[PDB]
Amino acid sequence: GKGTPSFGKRHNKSHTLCNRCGRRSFHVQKKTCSSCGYPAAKTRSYNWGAKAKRRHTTGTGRMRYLKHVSRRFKNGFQTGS
Amino acid sequence: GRVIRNQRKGAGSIFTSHTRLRQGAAKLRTLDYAERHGYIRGIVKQIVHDSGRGAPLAKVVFRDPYKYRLREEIFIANEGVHTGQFIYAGKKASLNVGNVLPLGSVPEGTIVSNVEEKPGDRGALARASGNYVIIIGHNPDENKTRVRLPSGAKKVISSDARGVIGVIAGGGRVDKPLLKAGRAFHKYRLKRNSWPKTRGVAMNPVDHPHGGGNHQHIGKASTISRGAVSGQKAGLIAARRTGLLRGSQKT
Amino acid sequence: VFQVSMKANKYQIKKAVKELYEVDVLKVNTLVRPNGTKKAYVRLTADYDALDIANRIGYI
Amino acid sequence: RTITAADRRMVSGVTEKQYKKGMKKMQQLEKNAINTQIRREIKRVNFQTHYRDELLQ
Amino acid sequence: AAQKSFRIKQKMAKAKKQNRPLPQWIRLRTNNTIRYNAKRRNWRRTKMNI
RNA sequence: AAACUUUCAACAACGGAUCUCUUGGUUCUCGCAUCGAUGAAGAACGCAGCGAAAUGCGAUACGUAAUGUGAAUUGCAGAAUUCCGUGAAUCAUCGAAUCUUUGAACGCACAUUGCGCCCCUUGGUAUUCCAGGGGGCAUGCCUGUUUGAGCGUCAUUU
RNA sequence: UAUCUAGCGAAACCACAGCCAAGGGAACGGGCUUGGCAGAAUCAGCGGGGAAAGAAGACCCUGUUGAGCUUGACUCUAGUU
RNA sequence: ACGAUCAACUUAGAACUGGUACGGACAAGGGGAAUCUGACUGUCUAAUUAAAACAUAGCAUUGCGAUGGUCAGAAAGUGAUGUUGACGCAAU
RNA sequence: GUGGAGGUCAGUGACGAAGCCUAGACCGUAAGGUCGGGUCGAACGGCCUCUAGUGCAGAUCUUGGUGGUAGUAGCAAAUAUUCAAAUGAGAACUUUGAAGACUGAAGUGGGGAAAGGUUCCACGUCAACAGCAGUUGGACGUGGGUUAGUCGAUCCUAAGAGAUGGGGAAGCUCCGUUUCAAAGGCCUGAUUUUAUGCAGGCCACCAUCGAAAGGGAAUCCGGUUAAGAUUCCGGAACCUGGAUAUGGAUUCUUCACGGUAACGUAACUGAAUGUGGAGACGUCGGCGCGAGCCCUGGGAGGAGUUAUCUUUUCUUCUUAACAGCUUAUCACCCCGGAAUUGGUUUAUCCGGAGAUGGGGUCUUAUGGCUGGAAGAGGCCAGCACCUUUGCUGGCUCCGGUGCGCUUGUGACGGCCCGUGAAAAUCCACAGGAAGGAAUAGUUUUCAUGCCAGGUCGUACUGAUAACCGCAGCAGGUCUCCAAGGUGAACAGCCUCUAGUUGAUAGAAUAAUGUAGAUAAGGGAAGUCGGCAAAAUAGAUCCGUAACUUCGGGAUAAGGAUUGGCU
RNA sequence: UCGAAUUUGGGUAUAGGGGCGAAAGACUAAUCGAACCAUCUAGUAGCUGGUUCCUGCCGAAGUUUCCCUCAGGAUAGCAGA
RNA sequence: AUUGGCGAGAGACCGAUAGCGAACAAGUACAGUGAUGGAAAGAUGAAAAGAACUUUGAAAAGAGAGUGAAAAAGUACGUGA
């Protein structure tokens, strides 16, 4: 039986938690995150995966810093009071 | 069609040799000054089995000429070398069983083994169990020596290329018939996963050039040209002649 | 029994207690409370009474 | 518990009666959502890609 | 598992903190839309998939 | 003849169509040019008196500072001259800060909250061991500095 | 177990539905035509029928639709000489 | 010639006895004469085929002395056999 | 006829627009238009034009919703439940007690690995889930809970993975793992200019990751909680790292003595540099030994049984880590010199290369005695009599046996064309650098003394309900401990400790089934076919053919016996 | 079948024209005579199915010729405007 | 030039099965080991005035009472096929 008995046999984990992206997609044996490409410097994006970009492009996150550049540009990057 | 069994053997993966239990690379000493001018005296500390090799190994310990250290060299044993024997390796060494002599220094008809093919490497001829080479002749003006190899072929090699004196020992090994398939299984458990070996003509045509057909038959001539591309070379490759010899074929 | 910032270890817990409260601690045992926070059992020497110290801090 | 969650919510403005009423409403709403999900799933949850069907076809 | 990585137990603790119904006082706010906790993960129904 | 079945109406159900709205989307036009080793985008974990989420934020944590407005926030509690004022607000503006663990990610690593090393400092009879605090240690490359190597080589010198 | 009761309670299928004989008919009707007949509501079985249900027949053919595979088909090609 | 004391189940033998039963439940081989076929032990179509199919030991053939044979890589100062050397490796 | 647009009717409308319902009315042949009634609550229409995402019954159409089938199929594997009380609105299902039972130690028991993630535990509680029920729950609401120098990760390396220098590729990147590289870190004591050069020496090594089952420094008992534990508490130890004081030890013979020797000790300098050992290792068989368990006798307590019998049946009588002394097969040393060859194992091996014999040396696995430690724990008795339940008493002793079972282990034997890891780390040895002489000093592998030991995991399940199979699924998932009887047996059947008594029930007993049996006479006549079933079956003894590769065939075939009791 | 070519955990390697195969086209996450995911892609169809309001008037063809043409077109013809 | 970013103005556009997938705690819940796949879900009323109080019931609720212009608006909430 390749169905119910085999599905019992599975208890390991091929993938675990990636450090750069929180997805449980970091391949343990290959040591690469199948989603974000970590530890490769370039985050794994592809043009055939338009949704894949849409889920992780700029705008899905806090933007701890990029939010305020528009204000700083609107005022001309002033300084002081 | 599919990549056939012999094709995918070159990629490695599961077809690499099983080197865990081996004692090391069995090689003569490096052609240093002492060994190329005179001789040096090692002591055969121990003789050990080496998995996947049919012949025992002799661990000969030498004094380093240039420091305190003692260097352990792993020779392929020669029938008659025993633990505690002194091994003299080099040009000035006398002609006693187990010693290493450059082929220029050994008279015609001497029986050597583990012969350095080109001076400087560390043994390349007559290393399998019970094999040897015969010193056919000398050319002192050209620093060459004719030798007879285990296959029956003559070869001219530099007379300063070393070789150990005697026979490789462990001989007669292939005379005992393995009876169980387990004997071959344990034989090839320590050798590179060559076994068992599915016959091609039982394979399906996608798997092997012989495969397929309502009868197990090759259907095309099994002799394959030297110039056939990889993936076509299955069966008798570049055969000069097939069939039973039915002749003396020399001794 | 204290809640301790998870960045702290046994030495820092020992030094902090000796500083915040003028007491000497016998030994420190710590665990990560299942809600994700350090929990420290700080045992004082035999010359201090934790019951007096606890009510001095302000919990009975 | 010198102070209980009952007290920490009575200060927050939900009495016991209102807490029970609201909890009942949430439980009921969640059960309604489960009813709807079962309704909408039963139609297509049985669609297996590679069911072998012993007596094929 | 019995032997846990510290990272796994951190996610553990996050789920325990999250596993609770709505704070009741939220329902009384003006223009309140939240009817109930819709992300209520529970161990019998949905695994954390970590 | 009842029952039952069927059709219709009324009322009541199941269901959420129709109608009416719309802080959304889509398309067009106009204007502007501003991410990041001064650590970006992204991620994990935490933060509220009472919050799980969304939003905001980083141990200074639904935020601090500055400036403007000028009396609220609000579900409850609390605060209440805090309001004829350097002053409320989940206000707006935003030029000073904080900015956990990460992440190009940068001491080495990582499925470890693992292992170093250096300077200053403090404690423990301590330059050496241990511990706390502070500051650092990536690579490629450019210019320059300093120390060098080579019978590659010049001259001087015994 | 089936059966009867308390509780719980689905699925397949379903144009409308359901008594036959013959006739003609897309050459084997539940309906059409001529006859036989024909009285509510039903229970447990039953396997004749509903050309019963399950799947846009896999057998066969057509497609100027493929794919696996072979060769001495056509045209190329890695390697190699 | 040889005495005292302590402690095991293991085999045989004999009576007596019984509604001739007694491996009393449980446990627990059907055998013989052959023929086809595959030597055997072993393995595979997980979920319709466990076989006479595959494998195997044995036998035989082929290539190769490393500047090599067989094979891999897009390339490389690349790699498997090879920690190898014809009593070996490779293809049958 | 519909959505929208331009114009117009100063169009209709909260005194009710749009919509929706209406076997009520009117108009048109029709698409459709109009009106009344009800419901309703904020927009909408006629006409002249414009514009299109503009008209549904189908498409195995898409989405959403609902039927008949139908209170039907069914809720039937895992032996099995029954009585009373309590609680409650309500009890077949909850709780307690009483029975009856099972799992039967290769368990339904007691712990873990992977995995799950709070399921653990308490109080409250039933809306939903628990395919019946529910007061109950792995459910719902709110909280509590996981304590380590010694257990693991951490450290090592394994098959492998993978940077740097290099070299390819347009390129994301690829090869490679010590290589065509100018690759650094230890010992110091130091100059007191200074950096970390150094007195300067040494080293030439070759980044790093890879095991919660391999290697590895060090811990045990007793007690304790609602839930923790080799972690807490009491008590008792050890290891590592570090300062180190005292005592001992050692010398004018500077770096100890003794023994013939194997070798002994409380110690008893020792760099660079090398050597060696440990780490470090297959599998099976029988044998010796130990531990734990099992069986059993005496005796000191309790319980049960007692028509009768029973010196009875059941039960407690235990000693941890760690420390001192002692303890061993093997091995080795000395004396001696062997044929009348001897010693000896279950197993044939050993001796002039020195046997047997006499006497010694060692390893301390291991057992014994003692300290730990009876003060614990256990079992009883008496008095207090809500008490943490207290207080006080005793006893806790001496043996026996074995092809017993599990396990550890020693010396051996067999097998291989199989000879069955590596590294960290630790030690020792060779060498003799350097240092130390008369209070001169050297050490400090001896005893005692002092300080510290971080981070992370620690609850629970581990499965007919906590993992995966869409679920509370007869499936699947690695492992440890294993009582008594029968019996060859961790087979089958029954029991002890422990755990459950869970699976929707009640009433009848038709057909057809599923599962389990038996059938007179015949005995394959059934059938594609002896398919299914039946027969034989354990053990001891007798007997055993053809053929054969001489090993087999073979338990051939075929017969006899089988208890109990003395 | 049950001591071995045995069974099995964990780690590790091989990845799609590729792996792996004691060889069945087997296995490669219920997928295998070429896995899974996304994009090119609304791929093309001489083939099947559907193709939504009313009324009025007119109202046929399955034939000629040519096509790798024979389930289809072009061409005339028939039909409307 | 501009389907990205920031800020604006508009439409013979769509009007909750439409329009982006998302008018909402939407790239969320959820499935898959992973690449990825990926929804559903708006409307009480002007104002909660969200039904004090009595009564039957163990309780949920029911019957009265009451708020409201309207419970033929009762958080299952416009209309309600």
Defining traits:
part of a larger assembly; 5 chains; D: 57 residues; mainly alpha; E: 50 residues; 1 helix; RNA-binding; structural constituent of ribosome (chain A); Ribosomal_eL37/eL43 (chain A); zinc ion binding (chain A); ribonucleoprotein (chain A); rRNA binding (chain A)
Structure description:
The structure is cut from a larger assembly and holds chains A (81 residues), B (251 residues), C (60 residues), D (57 residues) and E (50 residues). By secondary structure, chain A is α+β, with helices and mostly antiparallel strands. Chain A contains three helices and two strands. The radius of gyration of chain A is 20 Å and the shape is elongated. Chain C has helices at 10-20, 50-57; strands at residues 2-4, 25-33, 37-44. The longest helix of chain C is centred in the first third of the chain and has 11 residues, at 10-20. Helix content of chain C is 32%, strand content 33%. Chain C has a three-stranded antiparallel beta sheet, with helices on one face. With 57 residues, chain D is mostly helical. Chain D contains two helices and no strands. Chain E is mainly α and 50 residues long. The longest helix of chain E has 13 residues, at 6-18. Chain E is elongated and about 45 Å long. Chains in contact: A-E, C-E, D-E. The interface between C and E is small, with 4 and 8 residues. Chain B binds six RNA strands through α2, β11 and β12. Chain C: It comes from Saccharomyces cerevisiae (strain ATCC 204508 / S288c) (Baker's yeast). Chain C: One of its GO terms (biological process) is ribosomal large subunit assembly. Chain C: GO terms for molecular function: RNA binding; rRNA binding; structural constituent of ribosome. Chain C: This is Large ribosomal subunit protein uL23. Chain C: It is found in: Cytoplasm.
Topology:
This is part of a larger assembly, with chains A (81 residues), B (251 residues), C (60 residues), D (57 residues) and E (50 residues).
Chain C: E1 2-4, H1 10-20, E2 25-33, E3 37-44, H2 50-57
Chain D: H1 5-10, H2 16-42
Chain E: H1 6-18
Chain B binds 6 RNA strands through helix 2, strand 11 and strand 12.
Helix and strand composition category of chain C = alpha+beta
* Most extensive contact: D-E, 12 and 11 residues
Q: How helix-rich are the residues of chain A, as a percent range?
A: 10-25%
Share in β-strands of chain A: 5-15%
Largest sheet of chain A: 2 strands, antiparallel
PDB class: ribosome
Keywords: ribosome assembly, translation, ribosome
Entry title: Eukaryotic 80S ribosome with Reh1, eIF5A and A/P site tRNA
Chain A: 60S ribosomal protein L37-A
